[PDB]
Amino acid sequence: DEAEKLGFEKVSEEFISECKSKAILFKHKKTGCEVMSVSNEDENKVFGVVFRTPPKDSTGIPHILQHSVLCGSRKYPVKEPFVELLKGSLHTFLNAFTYPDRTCYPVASTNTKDFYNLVDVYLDAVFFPKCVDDAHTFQQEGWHYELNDPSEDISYKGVVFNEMKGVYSQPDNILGRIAQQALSPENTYGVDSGGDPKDIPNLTFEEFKEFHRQYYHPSNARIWFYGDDDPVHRLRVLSEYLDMFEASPSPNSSKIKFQKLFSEPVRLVEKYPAGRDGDLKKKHMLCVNWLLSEKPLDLQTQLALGFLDHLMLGTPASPLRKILLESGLGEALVSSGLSDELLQPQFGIGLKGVSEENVQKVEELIMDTLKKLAEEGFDNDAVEASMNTIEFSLRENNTGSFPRGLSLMLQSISKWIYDMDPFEPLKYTEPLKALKTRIAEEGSKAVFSPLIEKLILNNSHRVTIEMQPDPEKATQEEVEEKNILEKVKAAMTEEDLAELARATEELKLKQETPDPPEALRCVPSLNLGDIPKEPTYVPTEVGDINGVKVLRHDLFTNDIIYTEVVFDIGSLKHELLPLVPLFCQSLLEMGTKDLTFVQLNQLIGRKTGGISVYPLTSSVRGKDEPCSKIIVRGKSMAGRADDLFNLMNCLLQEVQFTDQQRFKQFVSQSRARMENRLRGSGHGIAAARMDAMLNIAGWMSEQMGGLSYLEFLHTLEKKVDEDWEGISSSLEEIRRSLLARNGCIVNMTADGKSLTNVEKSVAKFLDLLPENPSGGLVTWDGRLPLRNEAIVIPTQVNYVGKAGNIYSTGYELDGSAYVISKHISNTWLWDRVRVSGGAYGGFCDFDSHSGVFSYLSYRDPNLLKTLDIYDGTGDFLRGLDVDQETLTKAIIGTIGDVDSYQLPDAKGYSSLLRHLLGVTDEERQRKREEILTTSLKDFKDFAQAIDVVRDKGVAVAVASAEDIDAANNERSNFFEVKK
């Protein structure tokens, strides 16, 4: 027995048919560390280590430690080994997560050598971090005082400190934290594992050290391997770390305790930060929340609840979701759904955008609706739709760019971490069949009504939360923090303050001084020869069906067909452009002459894997004419391809644009969505503003997704009551302008047998379309004026952007630009914008189709300081000495981004986009060879190209009113002020 000779006892072993894997549970004899080793033919290998880390306060220790362990370890004594992996590895996944009760460290890769490189850095980080040796990392990642000069105010700074101020300022994050903590006041979930900014400064390095000593011990660890690598070698890898420890009792300390269910419901009123120039009376929220049980529920109940959650909320047609939204009492759902990832399952439901006087009504509606579902039950067509949809997704197992092995780990860990069976959550074929059988034999009412009745309606463990906008909350919090720090300063002697100002300057210089290439040599990399000279092969065949371009990709898809039908919106009247996204929504959430929208949705849910309709807009390298499309993206079993294309035609051609009230609710939902895009994702808004000033593709998207769209939405509610017939006929001319056989493109991904069978369905679908669209043939120009702009929101944190067109310098695209851009992001901007500056993140974005090079920051306390960092990028590049090993790493890191692992639908889709944007296979290959040969000269050449962004680039910021005038007083009339 190889295992036992390496110190591991094999506990349990099963074949899981669901994931075609042999899964083995080992236990390290000496420490008791448990290892789930899952072998299969999946080349996207996955590793993770998870520690059970319940906090006992809101100081944020687990979260701070999660950041700190990745800042240097025994074998990797450099500032930030995590970023070195980000820079120079072929990973498919690289991250770290702090959950309320556990901290996870996962990596993935298709390349076995790369995989084991990543695994070693992670193992050494969590077990032998440098952050427990002295306080420096703790201070940087956690909290420290900063004083620029004894004459000035002291401030609090730190990665996690700043991150949590960001978080605690987003209304929806506030609500979910209030709910979790109010539901579970007597265990670890009653406190914040990420850290409350009011409490983070109470944390001492000593507490932080002890937390690591106790909890980051193999005895308290669970380890996951998944994939096609050698099973025995996994244990050999682990023995290096596991053998270096003795058994520890800490798992007895880390065990999570159940919250005993309340005997009476709880009612709470809480504040979130709001803007003053906004009608506060209208932006309340109401959420009702439950803890569903104390006992771990039987495995059939767990499945049945997940099914129930989908049945009530899975689609726009699902009754709870549908009834709440059509009430008109709110703008959108909030903190809604089942969550079962923690010890006890929790269900919540609520609305945001509720008027003050309607809050009791939302509560009454929620309760009435839930009672109605228990009493009347669910129609069998709804139940069949959920069952097909669910069975389809489990079979497809489409995790996107998230590894399948990681998704499995997280399912296993959700029970394993509470000392329950780690195999059980991986299984679903048998439980699902049994549920299906109960529904046929007893009916949905007998299956689902008792769950609603006893776990929800008759459950006194209920928390109701009303959230109210507070225009002063944020100012008052800044006031308390300032007064706290003024007393800190007042309590210090002149020399205490000189010492702190010196520690400040010392820290700033340390984090602005990169580790030299000599140091970074401890982190290994692949050879440039370990890298395929060719791109990932995707079988494309260009063909022709009913006078229409068709792309076929012959790939194993597990008997699923993926189709995209691409219509052109290049010549849509400009007045129609901003209505395109609501047009797409109307196709999917209105009925036909013959069917209601519920009946159509249920047909789609019963027969297919879903259909979506969305705009796509991009520049095309070499032309002024943009690629501007609406895409209808559908999937089904190959045997239901016929039903898929029938339903797509039904959506496209038969839906009637007559539902005024549903259209009004789309508007409100969209307004809600845009408003919190601005708040928590303003960098996407700035990027859109800037592109809109620079090219037609950019201007078009911003009409449909930026500031211009939000502005358009406000004009729209008057237009919907006063002139519905105008809106409806606009919707109808968009359809007329787009639905045509001529210049349509059809993308198909499925195995070769399915494709043949599918073409008959495609041919028939194409037959039913008009030949030519209505409207013009010309793509008419649009642009926003080039202006520096600042967009005002209520926030603590900003989002700062700068961009310009680097092709305008006469710089010509070379693949080295991809390498350099990635390097800029992970070195200069990482070090200055995030670490030194205090932003959650900073990065650059190169659109090689338009030539626009953009700088962006995310949740940034600064504004003009950030723009200054952006301007210094050319000198950084010019100042660089990059040895061959540095070049090699930057190259590998870019090739990893380019060779990123894709499931077959993503392959065929990426191939579609290359065709649309004119990227031929010989262009791909030429660009890859340019990537593989990037040199020091390239870095210097590129410096001169991006200096045009410094000299002639435009800045757009989404920021505080305070910071906008503060900056407009330092640089007079720099930013034009948009409210």
């Binding site: 980000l86 991250n95 770290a96 997560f97 978080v167 594992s193």
Partner: peptide, 6 residues
């Protein structure tokens, strides 16, 4: 909850 590094 889930708080990430990158």
């Amino acid at each position: 909850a889930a708080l990430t590094r990158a």
